[PDB]
């Protein structure tokens, strides 16, 4: 109220001596003691389930860390780190200790979900694009997202550093219908070749989209403009 007015937080929440501050979100008040008069402080609070809830606000006021513990303030249940640019990463734990779910959310709304995480890392991988959704697996060395159309399988790999590599395998065995691929890590383009003749280019953009550019009949140069993919069947149709 007075002498602590308010300020908005990363994630649509508010925060308002013997510095002192008081916050409130999720139907109950959280209060603590900060170090400055901007909102840089932790916020303690308790839930009806006797579970301990902790909100850690960074000193730059651009990174909120909301944590949920059991009746003991040590064993955690969920942990959602939200940044200023909406770059969120929420985790959930199986009560064994291991993280069972990890929901990575990017700035442009594209979320990256992981479910069914075993004790080693193998788990269901599902990336939520805009208009369509990709699914795949998770190995301990990369994130693999696969799109299948008959024999052709489009594998979008994601290294743990974050760079994207894409390959293509075809169980076909006909020199006129077999589909090979060519990847360019610099231009981020996958070029599909059929019978020693190029067919189309797929570009994986830094805006987390995919564009399709069909080659001409002679397979020497592109033609027309690129079509941003909106339906999942548009990715399958390019693999036909």
């Amino acid at each position: 109220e007075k002498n602590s007015v308010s300020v908005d937080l990363p994630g649509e929440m508010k925060v308002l001596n013997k510095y002192d501050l008081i916050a409130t979100v999720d139907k109950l008040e959280l209060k603590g003691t900060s170090d400055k008069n901007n909102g840089s402080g932790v916020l303690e609070g308790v839930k009806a389930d006797k579970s301990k809830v902790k909100l850690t606000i960074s000193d730059d006021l651009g990174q909120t860390t909301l944590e949920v513990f059991k009746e003991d303030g040590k064993t955690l249940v969920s942990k959602k780190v939200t940044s200023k640019d909406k770059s969120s990463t929420e985790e959930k734990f199986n009560e064994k200790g291991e993280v069972s779910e990890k929901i990575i959310t990017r700035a442009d709304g594209t979320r990256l979900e992981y479910t069914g995480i075993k004790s080693d890392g193998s788990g269901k991988a599902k990336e939520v694009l805009k208009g369509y959704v990709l699914e795949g697996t998770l190995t301990a060395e990369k994130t693999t997202l696969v799109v299948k159309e008959g024999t052709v399988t489009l594998s979008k790999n994601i290294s743990k550093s974050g760079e994207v590599s894409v390959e293509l395998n075809d169980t076909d065995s006909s020199a006129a219908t077999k589909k090979t691929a060519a990847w360019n890590s610099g231009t981020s383009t996958l070029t599909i070749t059929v019978n020693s003749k190029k067919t189309k280019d797929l570009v994986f953009t830094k805006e987390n989209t995919i564009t399709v550019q069909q080659y001409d009949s002679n397979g020497t140069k592109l033609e027309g403009s690129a079509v941003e993919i909106t339906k999942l069947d548009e990715i399958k149709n390019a693999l036909k």
Partner: antibody
Amino acid sequence: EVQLVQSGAEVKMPGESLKISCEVSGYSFTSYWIGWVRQMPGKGLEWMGIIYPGDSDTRYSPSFQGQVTISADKSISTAYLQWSSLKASDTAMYYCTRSISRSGPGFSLSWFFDYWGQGTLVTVSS
Amino acid sequence: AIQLTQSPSSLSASVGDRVTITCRASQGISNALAWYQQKPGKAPKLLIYDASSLERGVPSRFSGSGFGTDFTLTISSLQPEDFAIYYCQQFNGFPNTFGQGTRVEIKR
């Protein structure tokens, strides 16, 4: 009420076997991990291994893999630290510790220890 | 594994001095650090976990902060019963590693 009671001191010769126990009470024994920490004579702290009695999952530190057996018993709320054969260099004080799990990025987890046992001293000489 | 280096080795301060102890890692362990207090005889006792959160029962004069690779344990108003050895440990990268400790004495 959380208490971790360990076994008594031991005197062993090089080559003999030994199993020390950590009788547990105060909390839900099946919910928390149980670790083991070594303290060489007047020296630092060495973490040996850990056990989760919910499924008897032994995570051995590489410095002690194949050198010591860690077991648990959910029926009696007791953990164990067992040696196949004692060596003269194994003389140290050993602690059983209740552990709090933390998901370290990435693909794994580690723990910190909030409640400790009183310590069991193992002297190995001939 | 991950090596942890503390500072200093020994220390002497009078009752009331704000004493700080450092713990330097070799990697980015941003939040995974714990502080223990081994008193004369036995045994180690958890003081501060997650490098900021204080354990129940531990007096308010004990505090801790840190991020990245540099961390600092801080006693606000030293007390004679606070004479002990203080260890830091990392639990961000398997396996858990401890620091070599830090001795704290009292001047009178």
